[PDB]
């Protein structure tokens, strides 16, 4: 019963800097495989035979280890390397590793928040949500809080996140409070906060079920 | 090259059995074994077994005897993965690969999505997402809808830059999500900004302008 553990979960690297993951195994394996994969796609061979590079790999990659622990190295980082690396026992019964997620480090980026009421077709249909883009921001780390009338909801509140825009790297995140007709109705004020790194003070938008 | 052709997304209720395919072509496919691989969502890599060019030339992963039944047809150069009695512990994205010379699983199938549920084919309600200032974000709201996936785009994709779509979440056992679009505050109101959201599990296609107010 061999396992297989990836090291570190997830780390990002800016561009040009130097990166290695390890894959260590409970007992003793020959030959460790690698692959890469990017969301909504199939696994791409990566390293084969522990140090041996794919068709399809740029020699910026190189791959290393013997024993109970291996490694995978990327020389100098680039955007499309971003991606989640398996490592892969070589035999029977062929397990894969959890997988490290590689993200491409940028400078901050505070995320730019838009509130919006229940749209009037939803309304006259009987139904009310509210939704809340946090987007393009960077370190994915970041909490939102809803606000309706000054208190504070926990529930009803559903969140989905993107993962790094190909084009500038940041992160998004969508929030939505679902609530019915005379839920929304009866209170007046809906407010969604934002706390990110890039600030000490929470990020506010809110509008008001009647006026705004 | 040397190609994996996966059968198409599987929509099936608990307690019922499916059968995948995997079509090989640019080579001799008896010349090489065919493995199968699960992916549960958002999780990561798991071996199922592999098939050798004989029905039950087999190999599978202890926990997977009793789940998946592999088959080849040499005749066509297809490898079949049947799935039985399944649960929604079974929903996940299938991928075949060829084991390769070299000894690695050198090519693989675009993967097959099975979703296990008793819920019924519905399509989205779509609702528009109206704002307020400098670059203005507008959204759309596709909600309630099953199954996976919906298409969304924005001015019929004229408006591709600055397109957010965030990935659906289950609720109720239906899902819903919401795609947002960026835009100079010069270019809306002024101009038409509309979302199209197509569910082809369901036929459906649909069109809603995002308008002022809120």
């Known amino acids: 019963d061999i396992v297989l553990t990836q090291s570190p979960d997830i780390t990002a690297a800016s561009l040009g800097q130097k990166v290695t993951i390890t894959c260590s195994a409970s007992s003793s394996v020959s030959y460790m495989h690698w692959y890469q994969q990017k969301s909504g796609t199939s696994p791409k061979p990566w390293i084969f035979?522990?140090?041996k590079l794919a068709s399809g790999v740029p020699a910026r990659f190189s791959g290393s280890g013997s024993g109970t622990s291996y490694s995978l190295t990327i020389s100098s980082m680039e955007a499309e390397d971003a991606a989640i690396y398996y490592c892969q026992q070589w035999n029977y019964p062929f397990t894969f590793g959890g997988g490290t997620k590689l993200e491409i480090k940028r400078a901050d980026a505070a995320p730019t928040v838009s509130i919006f009421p229940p749209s009037s077709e939803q309304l006259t249909s009987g139904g009310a949500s509210v939704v809340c883009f946090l987007n393009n921001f960077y370190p994915k780390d970041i909490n939102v809080k809803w606000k309706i009338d000054g208190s504070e909801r926990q529930n009803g509140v559903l969140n989905s996140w993107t993962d790094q825009d190909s084009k500038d790297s940041t992160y998004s995140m969508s929030s939505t409070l679902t609530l019915t007709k005379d839920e929304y109705e009866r209170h007046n004020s809906y407010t969604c906060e934002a706390t990110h790194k890039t600030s000490t003070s929470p990020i506010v938008k809110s509008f008001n079920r009647n006026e705004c | 090259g040397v190609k994996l052709q996966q059968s198409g997304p599987e929509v099936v209720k608990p307690g019922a059995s499916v059968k995948i395919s995997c079509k090989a072509s640019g080579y001799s496919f008896t010349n090489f074994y065919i493995h199968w691989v699960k992916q549960r969502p958002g999780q990561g890599l798991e071996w199922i077994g592999w098939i050798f060019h004989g029905s039950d030339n087999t190999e599978y992963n202890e926990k997977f005897k009793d789940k998946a039944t592999l088959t080849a047809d040499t005749s066509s150069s297809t490898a079949y993965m049947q799935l039985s009695s399944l649960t929604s512990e079974d929903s996940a994205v299938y991928f075949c690969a060829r084991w390769g010379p070299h000894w690695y699983f050198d090519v693989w199938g675009q993967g097959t999505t099975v979703t296990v549920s008793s819920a019924k084919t519905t399509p989205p309600s779509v609702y528009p997402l109206a704002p307020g200032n400098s670059m203005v974000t507008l959204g759309c709201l596709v909600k309630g809808y099953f199954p996976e996936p919906v298409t969304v785009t924005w001015n019929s994709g004229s408006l591709s830059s600055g397109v957010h779509t965030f990935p659906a979440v289950l609720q109720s056992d239906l899902y819903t999500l919401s795609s947002s679009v960026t835009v100079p505050s010069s270019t809306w109101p002024s101009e038409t900004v509309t979302c199209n959201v197509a569910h082809p599990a369901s036929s459906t296609k649909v069109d809603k302008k995002i308008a002022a107010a809120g």
């Open positions: 035979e522990i140090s």
